[PDB]
């Protein structure tokens, strides 16, 4: 029952399906499309999640982001609560110059993250994203495998097709996850 084109095996998806059925699901309207991307990372689940949970600094693992600035505190000092907004700057030439994104879900216990795009300069509208970090622990002593799942839903512009939009989003998402992998694996190598 593994969704087509995912990148995860049957044994792996069987464990992750509760996390898939809980955090990654969407109601897709005629002018919308959704997708789900998986990334395997060889690194502890805490290290990967520690990078992902930082809403203030997405430019660390996110490929096309030159700089980012977080909006000042509406009465929350030490912790980033859901409802916070950030303003993201993107490299030149891309469909988007800049984006304003809001924190939707941050759960440290269940290791789930999410955010929505409100406004800015870009073609993609109403982009909702959910990122979960999951640990697959072998009963016998094997290497560490952490699986990151990131799903989204987005509106398709009237001039753009569904593939062209989805291919673009999948591309950005995977470059983000490949960087997160590269980063967390280099950090997990030096520590022990
Ligand atoms: C790099 C870039 C180019 C655009 O045209 C749209 C937008 C500004 C939203 C974007 O930041 C896309 C970000 C995506 C798809 C996922 C994310 O970051 O989690």
Numbering used by the authors: 11 to 202
Paper lines:
However, owing to genetic redundancy of the ABA receptors, how the ABA signal is perceived and transduced has been debated for a long time until a breakthrough in 2009 when a novel family of proteins containing steroidogenic acute regulatory protein (StAR)-related lipid-transfer (START) domain was discovered as ABA receptors. ABA-induced interaction of PYLs with PP2Cs releases the inhibitory effect of PP2Cs on SnRK2 protein kinases, resulting in the activation of SnRK2s and phosphorylation of the downstream targets such as ABF transcription factors. Furthermore, we found that expression of FePYR1 significantly enhances drought resistance in transgenic Arabidopsis.
We attempted to crystalize the three ABA receptor proteins, and found that only the FePYR1-ABA complex generated high-quality and diffractable crystals. The structure of FePYR1-ABA was solved by molecular replacement starting from a model of the Arabidopsis thaliana protein AtPYL2 with the statistics of the structure refinement shown in Table S1. The ABA-bound FePYR1 appeared as a trimeric form arranged about 120° from each other in an asymmetric unit of the P42212 space group. Although FePYR1 has the highest sequence identity with AtPYR1, FePYR1 displayed a monomeric form in solution which is different from the dimeric AtPYR1. The electron density map shows that ABA is tethered in the 428.0 Å3 of protein cavity with its hydrocarbon chain and cyclohexene ring fitting closely into the hydrophobic pocket of FePYR1. The terminal carboxylate of ABA is anchored in the bottom of the cavity of FePYR1 by an interaction between the positively charged inward-pointing K72 side chain with the negatively charged carboxyl group of ABA. Based on the structural statistics of FePYR1-ABA and published data, E160 and N186 are assumed to form water-mediated hydrogen bonds with the acid head group of ABA. Figure 3B shows that the mono-methyl group on the cyclohexene ring fits into a narrow hydrophobic pocket formed by residues F74, I75, V100, L104, F178, and V182, while the dimethyl group fits into a larger pocket formed by A106, S109, I127 and H132. At top orientation of the cavity, the carbonyl group on the cyclohexene ring of ABA points to the cavity entrance and is capped by the P105 in the loop (β3–β4) as a gate, and the R133 in the loop (β5–β6) points across the entry as a latch.
